[PDB]
């Protein structure tokens, strides 16, 4: 699709068979989820947003369909405002900005 | 244009002297500069992200321009690590998401 910005972008994934609402967040280098239980292994890692550093639990190579398109990519679980979609996945399903 | 999104969505504005390279971001509602002392009435703010709050001053009717495409809306102002061109303002230059 194309989506304008008057709105937040935000759209359903689907997660683990659990279905989302996320944003999809050009600004975000890395896709941060809410606490959620992820299978596998993970491990221990810090981020930095606008506020400063939390811990998150890096998840690799889970799917997650974003509005219709597959990803396979890095998760990070931990305490983010809001499940966001950074551009480690927005690359995969072949999302670009346009003007 | 079209954006990719391989690497950093980064770009020139201009807000008045002081050219600035800025994140196309649509995870940020609005637009948020790194300290810069701006002339004219504002509003203390405390806006949220990944590690928790920071405290801004809202400046109204600010032009920007991003990319040679004008703009002007609000502007925050406060100890950003990157300045952020949020949706306030991409609307204006006309920037979607696509995919
Ligand atoms: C609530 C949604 C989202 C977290 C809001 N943020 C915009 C977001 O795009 C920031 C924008 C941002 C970019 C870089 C540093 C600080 C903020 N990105 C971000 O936190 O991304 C993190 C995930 O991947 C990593 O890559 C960048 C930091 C990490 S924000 O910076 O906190 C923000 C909040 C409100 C306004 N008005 C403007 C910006």
Redesign the interface.
């Known amino acids: ?6 709105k ?2 935000l759209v359903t994934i689907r997660i683990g068979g659990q279905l989302k609402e996320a ?7 890395d896709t ?1 989820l809410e606490e959620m239980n992820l299978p596998g292994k993970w491990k221990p890692k810090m ?8 811990k998150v639990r890096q998840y690799d190579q889970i799917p997650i369909e974003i ?1 219709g ?1 597959k990803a396979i990519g890095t998760v990070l679980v931990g ?3 809001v499940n ?1 979609i950074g ?1 480690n996945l ?2 995969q ?7």
């Open positions: 699709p194309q989506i304008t910005l008057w937040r972008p944003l999809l967040d050009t600004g975000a280098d941060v981020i930095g947003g606008i506020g400063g550093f939390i509005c398109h305490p983010t405002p966001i551009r927005l690359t399903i072949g999302c670009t900005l346009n003007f």
